[PDB]
Each structure stands twice: as C-alpha cells, then as structure tokens.
C-alpha cells in the first residue's frame with residue numbers, strides 16, 4: 001500500500017555538522033509539493049550511523065510534524081543488535097511513524113535463522129508495519145529470498161527494500177511471494193525495471209534531487225508502461241550512476257548543496273564529495289536540467 | 292609493541308543472555324596461566340555490538356581487574372561514528388586499557404580519505420596507543436595498504452589487525468610499513484604465515500580454546516622458526532577452520548561450552564551453534580586434544 005517514489009532523505013547539516021533543522025523543513029515541504037509519495041527518515045542516506053539516538057528521534061519527529069499526515073513517513077530503525085532494534089522501532093511507533101525500515105544486522109554476520117529470529121523478535125515486540133532491507137555490500141550479510149519469503153508470513157512484516165540491484169533475483173523474489181509482502185527497489189539504476197516487473201515503488205537516493213522526475217518514473221513503471229518508463233528514466237539515468245561516484249550519501253549531499261538547498265555539513269567518517277567530482281556533478285545537474 | 296598470542300576473548304553469557312561474570316573471571320585467569328600474551332576485551336569475538344555501553348565498560352574493567360597488570364589488555368572501541376569512537380576510546384583509556392582496537396567504520400562505507408581522517412581524529416583526541424582493524428568481509432569497506440601506510444605516520448597508531456587472510460597482501464603491507472606500526476593477523480588459518488613474514492602477533496579466535504597451543508605457535512613463528520611453526524600449528528590447524536563453520540563467535544562459544552567452560556548464552560541476531568555442527572566440533576576438539 002505504501003507505493004511509488006519513496007525518497008531516502010538526507011539529514012541536512014550546518015558546516016559544523018549540526019542538524020540543520022530549517023533546511024530539513026524546506027526539504028520535506030518541497031518533496032510533498034513535488035510529488036514524492038513518502039519519506040524514509042534516518043536511513044543510510046540520512047546518516048543514521050552518525051546521529052545520536054536523540055537526534056534520531058528529533059529528526060524523525062520534525063519530519064512527521066512537517067509532513068502532517070499528508071504522505072506516509074517511514075523511520076529507519078535497523079541496528080545490528082536485536083534488543084536495540086526493538087527499542088528504536090518502538091520509539092518510531094510511539095512517535096507515530098507509519099512504518100519502520102530495518103536494514104539487516106551489519107558487521108556481525110548473523111545466520112539466516114538468526115536474521116529470521118531477529119526480524120520475528122522485532123515484529124512480535126512492536127505493533128507497527130516493518131520493512132526489511134537487504135544491501136549485502138554494506139552489511140556483510142545477504143538475506144536470502146527464501147528467508148524473506150519465510151518472514152513474509154508475519155502479518156506486520158509488510159515489505160522489503162531490495163538493494164541488490166540484481167534484477168533476475170528480484171523478479172524471482174516478487175514471484176515467489178504473492179502480495180504476501182511488498183518489494184521496493186533499493187537500486188536507483190535498476191528500479192524502473194524492478195517496478196515494471198512488480199516491485200511496488202522505489203526507495204530512492206536520486207529522489208533527493210529529482211523528486212518530480214522520479215515520481216513520474218515510478219507511477220509510469222508500476223503502471224507497466226515500459227516504453228515511457230525507459231524514456232522518463234533515461235532523462236535521469238546518468239544521475240543514478242554518478243550519485244554513487246563516492247559512497248552515498250556523499251555525492252547526493254553535495255548535489256543538493258550545488259542546488260542551494262543544503263549546506264556542506266556531513267559527519268566523519270564521511271567527507272564532503274572530493275573536489276575531483278564536483279564539476280562532473282554540476283555538469284550532471286545541468287545536462288538533466290536540474291539547475 | 293605487544294607481541295604474541297592475543298586472544299579475542301568471548302564474553303561468556305548465561306542462558307538468558309546476561310554476562311556470566313564468574314566465567315569471564317576464570318577465563319582471563321586461565322589465559323594468563325596458559326601462556327596468553329594479551330587479551331582484546333569486547334572485540335568482535337566478544338559480541339561488542341550486542342553489549343550495553345555499560346556492559347562494555349564493565350567487561351573491560353573486570354578483565355583489567357583480574358589480569359592485575361600481568362599482561363596488557365586491549366579494548367575494542369571501534370564504531371562507525373568518529374564521535375562515538377572517540378568517546379569509547381576515551382573511556383577505555385580512563386579505564387586503564389593499554390591500547391584500543393578500532394575496526395574500520397562498517398556499513399557506511401567511508402572513503403579512503405574518510406578512513407584516514409577518521410583515524411587521525413581519534414588519534415589526536417585520545418592519547419592511547421591505537422590499533423587499526425581491517426576485515427572487509429564484515430565491514431563493506433577495505434582499508435588499503437596505502438592508507439595504512441599514511442596512518443602509520445601518526446605517533447600513537449601502533450598497529451593494524453589484518454584479517455583479510457590474504458598473505459601475499461600481508462607481505463606487501465609489512466614491506467611497505469617499514470616498521471612504522473606493527474601488523475597482527477586477524478585470520479587464524481594463515482596467522483603463523485603472517486608472523487613468519489614479520490607480523491608481531493595474532494589477535495586470535497582459536498586462542499579462546501587452545502591458548503597454550505596458540506601461545507607457543509606465536510612465539511616460535513615470531514622467532515622465525517619455520518619448521519617448528521608449521522608443525523606446531525598443524526596440530527591445531529583443523530580448529531582454525533571449524534571455528535568458522537558459522538559466523539564467529541557462534542562456533543567458538545559452543546566450543547567453550549562443550550569444554551564445560553561457559554554456558555550456552557549468545558545474543559541475537561547471533562544464535563547458538565546450529566545442531567548439525569556440534570558433533571563434528573566435538574570430534575575436532577577431541578582430535579586436537581582439548582577434550
């Protein structure tokens with residue numbers, strides 16, 4: 001039911017690295033007016049890793065407040081500890097977020113059965129719609145289609161963000177399920193295809209800088225208009241590629257700065273996009289008529 | 292510079308998950324008696340990611356209490372947040388820890404420059420000897436040899452735990468460092484090889500169950516006695532392989548329990564060793580002469 005273009009929104013920061021509230025505000029508002037269907041707050045793109053547990057709440061809150069029940073808001077609440085994921089998700093519900101996006105425990109390489117217990121534990125512990133999130137490159141673990149299918153049986157595990165970028169594997173996953181649980185693309189570059197094949201939307205990085213263009217791509221692809229999907233997406237294909245020239249959200253945060261929407265702030269270990277990539281990015285934003 | 296067998300000690304747990312403090316005390320004591328040269332408290336093998344920050348400090352404190360200055364104690368204090376890492380390293384220092392082990396930020400894929408700035412910051416904020424820790428398979432990031440050689444310039448970055456298991460890569464690491472910082476194997480299977488090549492020690496998982504064996508293996512290898520190193524290590528070579536049949540620390544914990552040294556406790560997402568593996572493990576243990 002949460003469908004379409006879901007922006008994994010960045011957490012804007014001041015030069016000193018403090019959360020720039022106002023700029024955030026302008027973003028949420030801007031997204032809600034440009035077409036964006038929903039927002040993921042404090043996810044990878046929103047630097048969940050470098051924000052204190054209180055900044056998580058405060059940031060999730062500001063966004064829910066500004067949204068004003070207009071679009072659903074999803075809170076990033078994954079962690080590699082189960083007790084702690086349960087806490088974050090609970091706080092997400094209590095803040096009245098519509099859903100929680102939980103990445104697979106990273107770094108500790110839990111087994112498939114563990115991933116199963118992990119997610120089942122959280123689902124039983126909190127009464128909120130949960131979305132699984134697989135992105136092996138970052139986590140060290142790969143939630144198997146099989147396991148995901150196993151979890152689809154739990155009534156409040158309602159979806160999964162597949163960031164593999166592996167299309168065949170994604171179609172297999174969509175078919176293996178039924179509307180048992182939704183599938184969301186996590187790979188901007190292949191998202192249009194995943195959606196043409198059944199995926200219910202795209203938790204996008206690109207949406208941070210091309211919300212209207214991405215809204216239109218998702219609507220059209222979910223509708224199965226392959227021709228128009230390839231064409232609307234083509235006008236922003238390069239972006240998907242170059243917004244990853246360095247680890248997300250590094251490039252997207254600079255792109256935004258090059259749009260006067262946010263400030264250079266970004267927390268270590270992350271760093272401001274390297275000089276070397278800046279012009280190629282400015283160029284990318286022009287070629288695509290973004291600025 | 293710490294040399295020898297450095298055990299990545301497990302954090303003993305009671306059935307319900309609480310830290311088994313009595314067992315921990317005895318393990319530490321057993322290690323010093325068996326020949327263990329140093330202990331890494333709350334590292335990966337010690338379930339650092341599922342322990343409370345307070346449990347984290349308490350474990351460090353306890354181990355330093357029991358060791359009673361007889362061996363140096365290394366505290367794992369890595370985090371994917373620079374602020375968080377500094378906080379945790381400051382605490383370890385204040386707790387009396389001889390040095391800290393910091394895994395590269397995981398999940399958020401910082402850049403090489405980012406890894407450099409990350410470690411430089413922690414080094415400048417805390418005056419405690421620091422040891423870098425690279426294990427790409429778990430972190431999603433790979434601290435290159437070039438970056439390690441840069442960080443080796445910094446006065447209090449004394450060493451690097453190389454868990455790649457890529458010996459030729461380790462040969463290049465050690466040759467390029469020109470002694471600026473020590474190198475430790477983070478891969479039990481190849482550890483004796485890295486040491487013969489120049490590595491100062493092994494931050495070992497196997498030492499958890501074969502402390503005296505790994506202790507003489509380390510001494511001999513560091514002494515550059517290639518035949519004694521090979522034949523001593525051969526005795527417990529199957530152990531190095533089977534302690535990873537499932538993600539560490541799942542296997543080692545079960546090993547200790549079969550040795551009747553600890554209870555079955557282990558926190559989620561981690562799970563107790565899958566049934567099918569428990570028998571082959573006991574056989575490995577029996578064959579090795581541990582039971």
Ligand SMILES: N[C@@H](CCCC[NH3+])C(=O)O
Nearest residue numbers: 335426535536537538539
């Ligand atoms: N990198 C891991 C390997 C364990 C997982 C192998 N199945 C460690 O030694 O901490």
